Every structure is written in structure tokens, then in C-alpha cells.
Amino acid sequence: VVAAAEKTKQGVLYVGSKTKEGVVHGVATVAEKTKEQVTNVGGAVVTGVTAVAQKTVEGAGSIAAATGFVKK
Amino acid sequence: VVAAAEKTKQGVLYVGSKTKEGVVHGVATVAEKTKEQVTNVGGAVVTGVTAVAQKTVEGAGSIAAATGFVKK
Amino acid sequence: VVAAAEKTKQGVLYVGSKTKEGVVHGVATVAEKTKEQVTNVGGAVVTGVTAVAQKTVEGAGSIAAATGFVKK
Amino acid sequence: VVAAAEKTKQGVLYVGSKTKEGVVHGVATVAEKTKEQVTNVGGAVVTGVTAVAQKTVEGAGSIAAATGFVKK
Amino acid sequence: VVAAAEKTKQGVLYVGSKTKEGVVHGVATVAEKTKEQVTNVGGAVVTGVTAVAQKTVEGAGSIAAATGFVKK
Amino acid sequence: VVAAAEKTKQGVLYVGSKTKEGVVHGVATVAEKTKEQVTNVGGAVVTGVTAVAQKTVEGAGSIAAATGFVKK
Amino acid sequence: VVAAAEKTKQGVLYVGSKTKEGVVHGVATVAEKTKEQVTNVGGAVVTGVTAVAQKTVEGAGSIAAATGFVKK
Amino acid sequence: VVAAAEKTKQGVLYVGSKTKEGVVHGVATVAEKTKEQVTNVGGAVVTGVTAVAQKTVEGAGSIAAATGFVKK
Amino acid sequence: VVAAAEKTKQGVLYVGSKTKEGVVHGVATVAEKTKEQVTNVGGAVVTGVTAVAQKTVEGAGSIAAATGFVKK
Amino acid sequence: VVAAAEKTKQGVLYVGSKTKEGVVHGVATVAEKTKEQVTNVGGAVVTGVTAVAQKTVEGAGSIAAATGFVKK
Amino acid sequence: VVAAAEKTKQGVLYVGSKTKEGVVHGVATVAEKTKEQVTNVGGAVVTGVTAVAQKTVEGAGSIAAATGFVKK
Amino acid sequence: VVAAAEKTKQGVLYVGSKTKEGVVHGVATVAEKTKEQVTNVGGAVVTGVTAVAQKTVEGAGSIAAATGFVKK
Amino acid sequence: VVAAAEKTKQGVLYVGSKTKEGVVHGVATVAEKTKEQVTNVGGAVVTGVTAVAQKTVEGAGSIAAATGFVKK
Amino acid sequence: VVAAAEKTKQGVLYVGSKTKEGVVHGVATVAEKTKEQVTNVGGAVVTGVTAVAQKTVEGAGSIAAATGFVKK
């Protein structure tokens, strides 16, 4: 669960959105008369009409994630 | 669960949004007459009509995450 | 659960939003006549019509997170 | 749960919002005739129509978080 | 669960979206009178009408993920 | 579950979307009067009308993933 | 489950989409009065009307994946 | 050009229309760089997607019309 | 041009319209750089998506019309 | 041009309209750089999405009209 | 041009309109750099999204009209 | 041009309108750099989103109209 | 131009309007750098979002009108 | 131009208006750098969001009008 990124030294990014009547639902839990529900999120949930991820890592860059589920 | 980032040294970012009648729901828990519900979030939930992530890591950069669920 | 970032030394960022009738709900817990509900948030919930994250890490930069759930 | 950031030395940031009839709800707990509800928040909940996070870490910079839930 | 990325040194990115009546649902759990449901997410769920991932890794860049499910 | 990417040194990307009446559902779990359902996601679920992944790895770049399911 | 990519040094990408009445469903689990269902995803599910993957690896680039299912 | 109707004394009418994207042009005169155009209407021009004429004459009822065109 | 109607004495009418995006143009004269145009209307021009004429004459009822065009 | 109607003595009318984005143009004269245009209306121009004429004449009832055009 | 109506003696009318974004133009004269335009109206121009004419003549009732155009 | 109506003796009318963003233009004369324009109205121009004319003549009732245009 | 109405003897009218953002323009003359414009109105111009004319003539009732235009 | 009405003898009227942001322009003359404009009104111009004319003539009732335009 360890992330490292070291950097040693010795343009135009455009997003254009023109929406009419836009409805966005992200992580949603809708229920009625239920018994048990689990929504375990540990990653990267990106939800939307204009979902843009430009130049996520440019220099030295690290990401990490870890999820689990134990019930026994 | 350890993140490190060391940097040693020896443009135009545009987002344009023009929305009419925009409704955004993020992490939502809607229920009625239920018994148990769990919404465990530990990642990165990004929800929206114009969801833009530009140049997240430019120099030395690190991210980390860790989630769990134990019931026994 | 340890984060470190050391830096040793020896543009235009535009967001434009023009919304008419914008409704945003973040972390929400709506219920009626229920028994138990848990909304454990420890990550980074970003919810909105114009959700922009520009140049999150530019120099030496570190983030961390840790969540848990034990019921026994 | 330890964060450190040391820095040794030896542009225009624009947000423009023009909203008509904007309603924002953050962390909300709405209920009626329920039994128990928990909303444990320890991360970073950012909720809003123009939610902008520009240049979060520029020099040496560290963030940390830690959440838990034990019921036994 | 370890990710590392080190970089040593010794254009126009356009997204254009013009949507009318756009509805986006991300990670959703809809149920009625059920017994148990689990939605374990630890990867990278990207959901949206204009879902663009441009130049994800440009310099030295690493990603990682790990998920599990144990019931016994 | 280890990913590494090291880089040592010694154009126009266009997406154009014009949608009328666009509906996108990502990871969805719809049920009624069921007993158990599991949706374990640990890869990379990209869902949308204009789903574009341009120049994912440009320099030194690594990705990784790992999923599991044990019931006993 | 190990991926590495090291790079040492010593055009126009167009996507054009014009859709009318576009409906996209990604990973979906629809059921009624069932007993058990599992949707284990660990690869790369890309679902959409204009699903374009241009120049996925340009420099040194590696991907990996691993899935499992044990019931005993 | 004389109409008369004398009456001496000594159910359900349903129209149901459900249209999506309906465009109706009635008496139209579209031209460019012309010399002369005449649209003489004296009858009964009924133009439309659901054009219904139910029970036009039920009791004593008379209609009449007369048109002309002289140029010499 | 004379109309008369004399009457001596000694149900449910339903129209249902449900339109989405309905455009109606009646008597229209569109031109550019023309010389002469005449639109002589003296009848009964009824133009529309749901154009219903129910029970126009029920008792004693008379209609009349007369049009002309002389240029010499 | 004479109309008379004499009457001597010795239900439910429903219109239901549910329109979204309805545009109606009646008698219109649109031109540019023209010389002469005439729109002579003397009848009954009824223009609209829900154009209903229910029970126009019920008792003794008379209508009349007369139009002309002389230029010499 | 004479109208007479004499009467000697010896239900529910419903209109329901529910419009969103309704634009109505009646008698309109739009021009640019023209020479002459005439819009002679003497009849009955009824223009609108819900144009309803219920029970126009119930007892003794008369209407009349007369238009002309002379230029010589 | 004479109208007479003599009467000798010896229910629920509902209009329901629920409009959002309604724009109505009646008799309009829009021009630029023109020479002459005439809008002669003498009839009955009724323009509007909910244009209802219920029970116009109930007892003895007469209407009349007369228009002209002479230029010589 | 003579109107007479003599009467010798020997319910619920509802209008309901609920408008949001309603703009009404009646008889309008908009121009720029023109030469001559005439708007001769002598009839009955009724312009509005909820334009209702209920029970215009109930007893003995007469209306009249007369317009002209001479230029020579 | 003579109107007479003689009468010899020997319910609930509801208007309900609930408007938000209502703008009404009646007889308007807007111009710039023009030469001549005439707005001759002699009829009955009724302009407004809730324009209701209920029970205009109930007993013996007469109306009249007369307009002219001479330029020579």
C-alpha cells in the first residue's frame, strides 16, 4: 500500500461543455424494505456528462489503491 | 499506507461550462423501511456535469488509498 | 498512514461556469422508518456541476487515506 | 497518522461563476421515525456548483487522513 | 500493492461536448425487498457521455490496484 | 501487485461530441426480491457515448490490476 | 502481477461523434427473484457508441491483469 | 354566394394525439429573386399531423365558397 | 355573400394532445430580393399539430366565403 | 356581406394539452431587400399546436366573409 | 356588412395547458432594407399553443367580416 | 357596418395554464433600413400560449368588422 | 358604424395561471434607420400567456369595428 | 359611430395568477435614427400575462369603434 515518486533535475488544455438539462447521479444506493446492502468504494469513481482526465501524470507520478471485504 | 514524493532541483488550462438546469447528486443513500445499509467510501468519488481533472501530478507526486470491511 | 514530501532547490488556469437553475447534493442520507444506516467517508468526495481539480500536485506532493469498518 | 513536508532553498488563477437560482446541500442527514443513523466523515467532502481546487500542492506539501468504525 | 515512478533529467488537448438532455448514472444500486447486495469497486469506474482520458501517463508514471472478496 | 516506471533523459488531440438525448448507465445493480448479488469490479470499466482513451502511455508508463473472489 | 516499463533517452488524433438518441449500458446486473449472481470484472470493459482507443502505448508501456474465482 | 339552413322542431368524440418532434407548415410562400407569386386561398385548407373533422354537420347545416382570378 | 340560419322550437368531446418539441408555422411569406408576392386568404386556414374541428354545426348553422383577384 | 341568425323558443368539452418546447408562428411576413409584399387576410386563420374548434354553432348561428384584391 | 341576431323566449368546459418553454408569435412583420410591405388583417387570426374556441355560438349568434385592397 | 342583437323574454368554465418560460409576441413590426411598412389590423388578433374563447355568444349576439386599403 | 342591443324581460368561471418567467409584448414597433412605418389598429388585439375571453355576450349584445387607410 | 343599449324589466368569477419574474410591454414604439413612425390605436389592445375578459356583456350592451388614416 506504498506509493513513491521522485523527480530530480540537474500547451493548451481545453474542455468545452454546453449542456441543456443535464442530470448526473454518482454513487447511489436506492432501496426499499431491504435487509442489507454494502457499497464499498476504494478505487476512483468518476461520473459525469463531461468527464475529462487530461495529463494525469506528467512528471514522476504514482497512484495506488487497495480494497477488501471479509464477512466470515 | 505510506506515500512519499521528493523533488530536487540543482500553458493555458481552460474549463468552460455553460449548463441550463443542471442537477447533480453525489454519494447518496436513499431508503425506506430497510434494515441495514453501509456506504464505505475511501477512494476518490468525483461526480459532476463538468468533472475535469487536469494535470493531477506535474512534479514529483504520490497518492495512496486503503479501504476495508470486516463483519465477523 | 504516513505521508511525506520534501523539495530542495540549490500560466493561466481558467474555470468558467455559467449555470441556470443548478442544484447540487453532496453526501446525503435520506431515509424513513429504517433501522440502521452508516455512511463512512474517508476518501475525497467532490460533487458539483463544475468540479475542476487543476494542478493538484505541482512540486513535491503527497496524499494519503485510510478507512475501516469492523462490526464483530 | 503523521504528515511532514520540508522545503529548503539554498501566473493567473481565475474562477468565474455566474449562477441563477443555485441550491447546494452539503453533508445532509434527513430522516423520519428511524432507529439509528451514523454519518462519519473524515476525508474531504467538497460540494458545490463551482467546486474548484487549483494548485493544491505547489511547494513541499503533504496531506493525511484516517477514519474508523468499530461497533463490537 | 506498491507503485513507484522516478524521472531524472540531466500541443493542444481539446474536448468538445454539446449535449441536449443528458442523463448519467454512475455506480448505482437499485433494489426492493432484497436480502443482500455487495458492490465492491476498487478499479477505475469512469462513466459519462463524454468520457475522455487523454495523456494519462506522459513522464514516468505508475498505477496500481488490488481488490478482494472473502466470505468463508 | 507491483508496478514501476522510470524515465531518464540525459500534436493536436481532438474529441468532438454532439449528442441529443444521451443516457448513460455505468456499473448498475438492479434487482427485486433477490437473495444475494455481488458486483466485484477491479479492472477499468469505461462506459459512455463518447469513450475515448488517447495516448494512455506516452513516456515510461505502467498499469496493474488484481481481483479475487473466495467463498469457501 | 508485476508490470514495469523504463524509457531512457541519451500528429492529429481526431474523434468525431454526432449521435441522436444514444443509450449506453455498461456493466449491468438486472435480476428478479434470483438466488445468487456474481459479476467479477478485472480486465478492461469499454462500452460505448464511439469507443476509441488511439495510441494506447507510444513509448515504453506495460499493462497487466489478473482475476480469480474460488468457491470450494 | 348564398347559404341558408333552417331547423324546426315541433356520444363520445375522442381525438388522441401523442407526437414527438412534430413540425407543421400551413400555407407557405417561400421564394428568392422571383418576379410575381400569387397564393389565392378561399376554400378550406386544413393542415396538420392530427387533422380531424368529426361531425361537421349534425343538424341543418350549409357551407359555401367562391374564388376567382382575373388578370386581363 | 349572404348567410342565414334560423332555429325554431315549439356527450363528451375529448381532445388529448401530448407533444414534445412541436413547431407550427401558419400562413407564412418568406422571401429575399423578390419583386411582388400576394397571399390572399379568405377561406379558413387551420394549421396545427392537433387540428380538431368537432361538431362545427349542431343546430341551424350556415357559413359563407368569397374571394377575388383582379389585376387588369 | 349580410349574416342573420334568429332563434325562437315557445355535456363535457375537454381539451388537454401537455407540450414541451412548443413554438408557434401565426401570420408571418419575413423578407429582406424585397420590393413589394401583400398579406391580405380576411378569412379565419387558426394556427397552433392544439387548435381545437368544438361546437362552433350550437343554436341558430351564421358566419360570413368577403375579401378582395384590385390593382388596375 | 350587416349582422343581426335576435332570440325570443316565450355542462363543463375544460381547457388544460401545461407547457414548458412556449414561444408564440402572432401577426409579425420582420424585414430588412425592403421597399414596401402590407399586412392587411380583417378576419380572425388566432395564434397560440393552446388555441381553443369552444361554443362560439350557443343562442342566436351572427358574425361578419369584410376586407379590401385597392392600389390603382 | 351595422350590428344589432335583441333578446326578449316573456355550468363550470375552466381554463388551467401552467407555463414555465413563456414568451408571447402579439402584433409586431420589426424592421431595419426599410422604406415603408403598413400593418392594418381591424379583425380580431388573439395571440397567446393559452388562447381560449369559451361561450362567445350565449344569448342574442352580433359581431361585425370592416377593413380597407386604398393607395391610388 | 352603428351598434344596438336591447333586452326586454316581461355558474363558476375559473381562470388559473401559474407562470414562471413570463414575457409578453403587445403591439410593438421596433425599427432602426427606417423611412416610414404605420401600425393602424382598430380591431381587438388580445395578447398574453393566459388570454381568456369567457362569456363575451350573455344577454343582448353587439360589437362593431371599422378601419381605413387612404394615402392618395 | 353611434352605440345604444336599452334594458327594460317589467355565480363566482375567479381569476388566479401566480407569476414569478413577469415582464409586460404594451403598446411600444422603439426606434433609433428613423424618419417617421405612426402607431394609431383605436380598437382595444389588451396585453398581459393573465389577460381575462369575463362576462363582457351580461345585460343589454353595445360597443363600437372607428379608426382612420389619411395622408394625401
Residue by residue, DSSP assigns H32-48 as SS-SEEEEEE-S--EE-
Site of grid cell 363520445:
H12
The size of chain D, in residues, is 72
Question: Is the distance from CB of J59 to CB of I60 less than 8 angstroms?
Answer: yes
Select the residue of M6, M32, M38 nearest N38 (Cβ to Cβ): M38
Distance CA L34, CA K35 (A): 6
Grid coordinates representing N65 are 369603434
Phi, psi of B55 (to 5 degrees): 60, 55
Q: How far does CA D27 lie from the centroid of its chain?
A: 11
Whole-angstrom CA distances from C41 to C65, G41, G66, H27 are 10, 24, 28, 64
Whole-angstrom CA distances from A11 to B11, E12, E61, G16, J41 are 5, 6, 20, 22, 62
β pairing state of N2-9 and M2-9 = parallel
Tell if the CB–CB gap between E2 and F2 is shorter than 8 Å.
Answer: yes
Preferred mutation among L23, L41, L62, L72 to probe N, highest tally of N CBs within 10 A: L41
Residues of F in contact with A57 (CB under 8 A): 61
Distance CA K46, CA K51 (A): 7
Grid coordinates representing L65 are 368588422
Q: Which amino acid is at A61?
A: G
Tell if the CB–CB gap between E43 and G48 is shorter than 8 Å.
Answer: no
CA angle (D16 as vertex; D14, D19 as ends), nearest 5: 165
Which has the closest alpha carbon to N54: E41, L21, D20, M11? M11
Q: Which amino acid is at J43?
A: G
Distance CA B49, CA G32 (A): 32
Q: Please state how this structure was obtained.
A: cryo-EM
Residue of C nearest to D25 (CA): C25
Grid coordinates representing M17 are 395561471
Whole-angstrom CA distances from A35 to C70, E32, E34, F43 are 19, 10, 6, 29
Residue of L nearest to M31 (CA): L31
Preferred mutation among C2, C14, C25, C27 to probe D, highest tally of D CBs within 10 A: C27
Q: Which amino acid is at H43?
A: G
What are residue L1's DSSP bridge partners? none
Whole-angstrom CA distances from C35 to A33, C41, D43, L53 are 10, 20, 26, 57
B51-70 burial code (b ≥16 CB/10 A, e <16): bbbbbbbbbbbbbbbbbbbb
Strand, coil or helix: what is I24?
strand
Q: Is L12 exposed, middle or buried (0-12, 13-18, 19+ CB in 10 A)?
A: middle
Strand, coil or helix: what is M14?
strand
- B56's CB contacts (< 8 A; 6+ apart) are A53, A55, A56, A57, A61, C53, C56, C57
Question: Is the distance from CB of E16 to CB of E37 less than 8 angstroms?
Answer: no
Grid coordinates representing F39 are 458486483
Grid coordinates representing N56 are 363582457
Residue of M nearest to N1 (CA): M1
What are residue J15's DSSP bridge partners? I15, K15
Question: Is the distance from CB of L24 to CB of M25 less than 8 angstroms?
Answer: yes
3-state secondary structure labels for all residues of chain N:
CEEEEEEEECCEEEEEEEEECCEEECCEEECCCCCEEEEEECCCCEECCEEEEECCECCCEECCCCCCCECC
Which has the closest alpha carbon to F15: M62, G13, E68, J9? G13
Residues of M in contact with K48 (CB under 8 A): 51
Which has the closest alpha carbon to L19: K56, J22, I16? J22
Q: Which amino acid is at E60?
A: A
Taking residue D36's Cβ as centre, other Cβ atoms within 10 Å add up to: 11
Which has the closest alpha carbon to M8: M62, M72, M71, M59? M59
The answer to the question of whether B25 is labelled as a binding residue is: yes
Question: Is the distance from CB of E63 to CB of A3 less than 8 angstroms?
Answer: no
Which has the closest alpha carbon to E57: G2, G64, F56? F56
Q: Which amino acid is at G26?
A: G
Which has the closest alpha carbon to G11: G50, G59, G51, G55? G55
Distance CA B19, CA D21 (A): 13
Strand, coil or helix: what is E1?
coil
Which has the closest alpha carbon to F24: A49, C24, A45? A49
DSSP-assigned letters across all residues of B13-39: EEEEEEEES-EEE-SEEE-SS-SEEEE
Grid coordinates representing A23 are 442530470
Question: Is the distance from CB of I3 to CB of J62 less than 8 angstroms?
Answer: yes
Site of grid cell 412534430:
H22
- Count CA within 13 A, CB hemisphere, residue E57: 35
Question: Is the distance from CB of D64 to CB of B3 less than 8 angstroms?
Answer: no
Site of grid cell 456535469:
B49
Whole-angstrom CA distances from E16 to C54, F15, F20, H55, L72 are 18, 6, 14, 55, 60
Question: Is the distance from CB of N53 to CB of M48 less than 8 angstroms?
Answer: no
Chain breaks in chain E (C to N over 2.5 A) after: 10
Select the residue of H26, H41, H42 nearest J47 (Cβ to Cβ): H26
Resolution reading in Å: 3.1
Which has the closest alpha carbon to A69: D50, I33, E40, H51? E40
- E57's CB contacts (< 8 A; 6+ apart) are A56, A57, A61, E63, F5, F56, F57, F58, F59, F60, F61, G61
The size of chain E, in residues, is 72
Distance CA F52, CA G54 (A): 8
Distance CA I26, CA I49 (A): 11
Grid coordinates representing D39 are 454519518
Grid coordinates representing B70 are 470486516
What are residue J41's DSSP bridge partners? I41, K41
Which has the closest alpha carbon to A43: C53, E26, D63? E26
Taking residue H70's Cβ as centre, other Cβ atoms within 10 Å add up to: 10
Site of grid cell 521522485:
A6
Distance CA I45, CA H43 (A): 8
Grid coordinates representing L33 are 433600413
Q: Which amino acid is at A11?
A: G
* Torsion, Cα of C45, C48, C51, C57 (10° steps): -20
DSSP-assigned letters across all residues of G3-52: EE--EEE--EEEEEEEEES-EEE-SEEE-SS-SEEEEEE-S--EE-TEEE
Strand, coil or helix: what is J55?
coil
H-helix or E-strand spanning residue D30: strand D28-30
3-state secondary structure labels for all residues of M26-42:
CCEEECCCCCEEEEEEC
Distance CA A39, CA B28 (A): 11
H-helix or E-strand spanning residue E61: strand E61-62
Tell if the CB–CB gap between J53 and K55 is shorter than 8 Å.
Answer: no
DSSP-assigned letters across all residues of J57-72: BSSSEE-------B--
Q: Mark whether E and B touch (3+ CB pairs within 8 Å).
A: yes
H-helix or E-strand spanning residue M18: strand M12-20
Question: Is the distance from CB of D57 to CB of A5 less than 8 angstroms?
Answer: no
H-helix or E-strand spanning residue D19: strand D12-20
Distance CA J32, CA J9 (A): 58
Which has the closest alpha carbon to E25: B20, A45, B37? A45
Taking residue C12's Cβ as centre, other Cβ atoms within 10 Å add up to: 12
Grid coordinates representing N52 are 381575462
Chain B nearest C-alpha distance from A20 (Å): 5
Instruction: Please list the alpha-helical segments (H only) found in chain F.
Output: none
Beta strands in H1-72 (DSSP E): 2-9, 12-20, 23-25, 28-30, 36-41, 46-47, 50-54, 61-62
Q: Is A47 exposed, middle or buried (0-12, 13-18, 19+ CB in 10 A)?
A: buried
Tell if the CB–CB gap between N67 and L42 is shorter than 8 Å.
Answer: yes
- A24's CB contacts (< 8 A; 6+ apart) are A47, A48, A49, B22, B23, B24, B25, B47, B48, B49, E23, E24, E26, E48
Tell if the CB–CB gap between G27 and F32 is shorter than 8 Å.
Answer: no
H-helix or E-strand spanning residue D62: strand D61-62
Distance CA C47, CA F24 (A): 18
Distance CA J4, CA I53 (A): 23
Distance CA D47, CA C47 (A): 5
β pairing state of F46-47 and E46-47 = parallel
Select the residue of L26, L42, L61 nearest N47 (Cβ to Cβ): L26
Question: Is the distance from CB of N71 to CB of M70 less than 8 angstroms?
Answer: yes
Grid coordinates representing I12 are 363528451
CA angle (D49 as vertex; D44, D55 as ends), nearest 5: 55
